[PDB]
Nucleic acid binder design. Structure first.
Lengths: 73, 110, 76, 64
RNA sequence: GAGCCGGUAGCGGGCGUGGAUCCCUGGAUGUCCGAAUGGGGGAACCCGGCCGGCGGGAACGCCGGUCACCGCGCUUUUGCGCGGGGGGAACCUGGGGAACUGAAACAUCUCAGUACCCAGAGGAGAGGAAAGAGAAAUCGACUCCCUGAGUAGCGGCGAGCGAAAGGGGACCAGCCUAAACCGUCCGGCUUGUCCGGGCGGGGUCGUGGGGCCCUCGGACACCGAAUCCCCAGCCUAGCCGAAGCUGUUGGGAAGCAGCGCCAGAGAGGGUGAAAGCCCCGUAGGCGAAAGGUGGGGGGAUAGGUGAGGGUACCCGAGUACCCCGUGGUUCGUGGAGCCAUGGGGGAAUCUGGGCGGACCACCGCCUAAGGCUAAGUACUCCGGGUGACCGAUAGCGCACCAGU
RNA sequence: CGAAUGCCGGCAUGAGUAACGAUAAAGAGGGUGAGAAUCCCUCUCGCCGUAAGCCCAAGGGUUCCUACGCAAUGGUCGUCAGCGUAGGGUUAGGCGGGACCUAAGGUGAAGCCGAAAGGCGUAGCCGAAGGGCAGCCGGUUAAUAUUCCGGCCCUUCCCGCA
RNA sequence: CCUCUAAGCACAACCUGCGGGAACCCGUACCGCAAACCGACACAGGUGGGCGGGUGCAAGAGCACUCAGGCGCGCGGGAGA
């Protein structure tokens, strides 16, 4: 569990697949891909209870960094 | 004890004394009619069956172990020769001369 | 903690061994020159003279204490 | 059924120690013996082993 | 209750009615490995500090004991004192998560959220008092059975896949918490009026809380645990416990024969060949604890909530909502929503805000964006019973010096 | 249930033909035995001999000696065995491993990245007939030996005092 | 082995002498260019190091014969197509 984001959870799930559209605008569609993948944000530097660094990602970030809920800057 | 085998189970796997339960039996006139509680394991007896049926004998070794007993009478001789005590099958052991000169014997069953 | 040594190891050899000198025996297995020779020493008049030792596929360990220049007594 | 708990319990610490000492000594005796094959079955041997045993037991319990 | 040193029958020697063998529970030992954790390491073996006796140290000097891994809080101080982990046949949930095969190919698809691998909690977890349901202005935990429907319907509409509210049933119960407002204050900035956190106010069930003014009003409402001893159930052994003999063919009889009894216990087995009365410590039934686990049920412990109107209002979340890109769902990109989110935007606190499947108006419904919640369904290592189940090439493959 | 080159298990086939595992050979004498081409002593002889040598180790691991004994193993025997039963047999301050040293390489508090199991990894540890390090030759049983005996040469560590 | 902190000796530290004392944990037996090691068998397979005795050969672990030590291969007789 070393990839997440401290404030909340955001790694995982994510199943993509492509097709060849062209539908509600006269005639149906068609199905293709069948794949799974990653998907996330971004981490950075701050500190908790005597050093630590943090990590977390974008969102939460803008947040908890702006402030702090279980450690600080 | 609600099936055919638990018999062996409790009987000899639990109290060897249960085997004493086996010891259980009865005897002559006097004593018997007299009542039916407490015994002597080693007491006098007569075999009421087997060729030896109706044979006069004395109980020597109460042998609940092998699950039976030995009486001087019920005996057989070897082939090499020497005579020796027969394996006596509890089943037809009738006690009578109620071993009691032994104060405690008396106390317990007569 | 308690006991100590094992017992007298009498083997043709053994017998003679202990007889002209030293003596050989049933040594548990643990202990050693220290612990072992001790057990000896405390029990058998004589002091911690000398010793050598071996095991063997069997269980018992066999050790040797070369005499004190004094007593031993034929039958151990 | 011979000596007995309490009584021997009266038998103080270092005593407990001492007597056991000996206890080992004599049983070992026995040992050299059985080896020899000189004497015979000492239901004794067994018992003494036990005696020492319980001794210990209570000892321990009392609390060293 | 009177025999015993176990399966070895044998020898050689021994213990016990001054309740032995053994059944039970509650004891001390408890070598060395195995989370292994003191250190190392081809486990079961080899290495280290203090206490330890003082040990031979015959005129010479030990084992034993013991003792310290690391992740966990935090009384922080120099950190002392807690919890963890390692299991587990199958059961649970979550993390991750597949080909064959069917479509008579095969790319959608089905096999399935199936197999497996993982982390983890348990004895059961699941989940579980509503931004629900549905619409008769009706319903109100969560779960599990039947029923609903193989319906409503999803879909190269091709194989196939395929619900739910309502009815019946088992069960039944409910509680908080930030939630700044209040005050308490601590600790701060640097004194004000700032956030801060330990205390209570409230600490919302179906919407209020708090704060102001007067009505208040002045005792039976216990959960999931807390508590008593209760039947604490069981834990193994508890113990009573009805009544035939003579004859007789018999190697044996319990059988043939004569006469005799039992009986809420003619369940079965053991008895030299088939007995209600011979053995059976069986069904008749009574039985019974100083230990180790309950519901019931009893009490106080009892925690703990429990009224009136007013007033300009401040009071459960960081994100709903929207756009893209996926999930569940019966939905296969679709007229296609609800919830859940990946990435960017980034609201409103009661005329708030989602909801009733595009959307718009009106109505009806709920009040999220924190937490706990025994019981009703699953499962079988283990104990019991029972079987128109098996008889050693059949049963688990293994009925006994077999997963060897 | 012939009947699925069926599964299980017995049981016959060729067949008393085929084979005895290297064309490095044997023969005689006596000995022991219930019985010996097939064991023991012994005298003719053949084959190695760079090996069919003895040794260190690797691996196996009681197989070794000694008294017994042969049912099966021993591709014939077999009183012989590296077969069976039982007894007994391998001792080191200085041989060797450790109780020391490290590269590879592994581990690896810290540190680094994973969906979870993970990855990677400092230093420290593990990790060798590579480093290191204090003696040898005679003797002596059924057996062991640079360890037992003895002679001769040492080593480290300790208390003391100089 | 020398150079040195911390440091502690520094009439008590290291080096050096002599005397008394002390010295452990696992290992060997036999096989072992092999019926005892791998090939499922006493299978003419392979399997790391040590001079490898002598005579002859131009030299030599090649060759023929032997030394020490080893072995006669584990079935034997008998005809001879």
């Amino acid at each position: 569990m070393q990839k997440d984001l401290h404030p909340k959870a955001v790694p995982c799930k994510i199943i993509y697949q492509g097709q060849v559209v062209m539908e509600t605008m006269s005639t149906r569609p068609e199905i293709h891909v069948d794949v799974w993948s990653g998907v996330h944000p971004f981490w950075t530097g701050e500190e908790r209870f005597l050093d630590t660094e943090g990590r977390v990602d974008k969102f939460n970030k803008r947040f908890g960094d702006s402030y702090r809920r279980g450690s600080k800057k | 004890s609600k099936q055919p085998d638990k018999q062996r189970k409790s009987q000899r796997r639990a109290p060897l004394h249960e085997r004493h339960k086996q010891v259980r039996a009865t005897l002559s006139a006097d004593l018997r009619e007299e009542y039916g509680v407490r015994v002597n394991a080693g007491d006098t007896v007569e075999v009421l069956r087997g060729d030896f049926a109706g044979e006069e004998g004395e109980v020597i070794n109460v042998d609940l172990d092998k699950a039976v007993i030995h009486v001087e009478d019920v005996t057989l001789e070897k082939t090499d020769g020497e005579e020796v005590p027969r394996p006596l099958d509890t089943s037809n052991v009738r006690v009578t001369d109620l071993d009691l000169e032994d104060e405690k014997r008396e106390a317990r069953l007569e | 903690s308690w006991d100590v040594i094992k017992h007298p190891h009498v083997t043709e050899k053994a017998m003679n061994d202990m007889d002209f000198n030293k003596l050989q025996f049933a040594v548990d297995d643990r202990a050693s020159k220290g612990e072992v020779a001790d057990a000896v020493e405390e029990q058998y008049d004589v002091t911690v003279e000398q010793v050598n030792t071996q095991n063997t596929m069997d269980g018992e360990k066999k050790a040797v204490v070369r005499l004190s220049e004094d007593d031993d007594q034929e039958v151990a | 059924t011979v000596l007995h708990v309490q009584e021997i319990r009266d038998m103080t610490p270092a005593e407990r120690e001492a007597e056991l000492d000996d206890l080992k000594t004599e049983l070992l005796n026995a040992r050299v013996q059985a080896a020899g094959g000189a004497p015979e079955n000492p239901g004794r041997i067994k018992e003494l082993r036990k005696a020492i045993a319980r001794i210990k037991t209570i000892q321990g319990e009392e609390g060293d």
